[PDB]
């Protein structure tokens, strides 16, 4: 069946792209700062 | 004490570049496939 | 014998088109995501 | 362990593209033949 | 004869590419490690 | 004894680089030929 109102394949690809691109910000940040723990999000005791 | 503190806070540069490269390749693959998926539904027009 | 109420060839051509077009979604999804197993529909022990 | 895990989960990029091209060609062949089949039953009208 | 469902040349080329790419990992490893014997796969009496 | 042990275990850096270069060329040749082989079967469409 061929439809035009909804494009499930197109709908998916977007989600995959966002998931893949999420982590690049974190890796760039921790590679530029020089340290692995920059906020309490990453570790819970290491900062303590 | 100073040497001991460094084990749980500093970045490993040899390991950190690999994820940079991997994410960079994954993003390009995702973009190309997204364009393909968007262009797919065009063929229904010839039926009309 | 010519018949206009039914068109067997027309009825047949639709099924073949749908069968061919079924696999496109799976191949594009597994090519964009980068992984061969995205859901339990593909494997039953590989994911575990 | 990390090397062993990747043999049953990752995608072979060389293999998927051939299937992509095959499905793409089959779709166009099916569409053209469906249009031809739809146009076929017209010639009865000349008899009337 | 022209067919679509099979592409023997494409099927072949994949095999040759994998064969050529087999040895590069071994070469790189034995050049980075600095030793010619890293496991019993390379030799049987040399390690003993 | 230390001199004797080194003749059968250490890597020869002069010979491995040539093999590295040869394999690297073969990979590119194979990839280009594979892409051409994938693109070949498109010509059947004009007949339709």
What does this 3D model show about the protein?
With 48 residues, the first copy, chain A, is mainly alpha-helical. The first copy, chain A, is built from 1 helix and no strands. The first copy, chain A, has one helix spanning 8-33. The longest helix of chain A has 26 residues, at 8-33. The first copy, chain A, starts with 7 loop residues before the first helix and ends in a 15-residue tail after the last helix. Chains in contact: A-B, A-C, B-C, B-D, C-D, D-E, D-F, E-F. Chains E and F meet through α1 of E and α2 of F. It is classed as protein fibril. The entry lists the keywords Flagellum, filament, helical symmetry, protein fibril.
Secondary-structure map:
The structure is cut from a larger assembly and holds six copies of chain A (48 residues).
Chain A: H1 8-33
Residue share in β-strands of chain A:
under 5%
CA radius of gyration of chain A is 18 Å
Counted by DSSP, the helix tally of chain A is 1
Gross morphology of chain A: elongated
Give the N-terminus to C-terminus distance of chain A in angstroms.
Answer: 59 Å
Number of strands of chain A: 0
Q: What keywords describe this structure?
A:
48 residues, 6 chains, elongated, 0% strand, mainly alpha, 1 helix, part of a larger assembly
Brief sketch in words of this structure:
This is part of a larger assembly, with six copies of chain A (48 residues). The longest helix of chain A has 26 residues, at 8-33.
């Amino acid at each position: 069946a061929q439809v035009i109102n909804t494009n499930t394949m197109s709908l998916n690809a977007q989600r995959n792209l966002s998931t893949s691109g999420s982590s690049l910000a974190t890796t760039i940040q921790r590679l530029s700062s020089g340290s692995r723990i920059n906020s309490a999000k990453d570790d819970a005791a290491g900062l303590a | 004490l100073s040497a001991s503190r460094s084990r749980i806070k500093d970045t490993d540069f040899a390991k950190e570049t690999a994820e940079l490269t991997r994410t960079q390749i994954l993003q390009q693959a995702g973009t190309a496939m997204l364009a393909q998926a968007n262009q797919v539904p065009q063929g229904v027009l010839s039926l009309l």
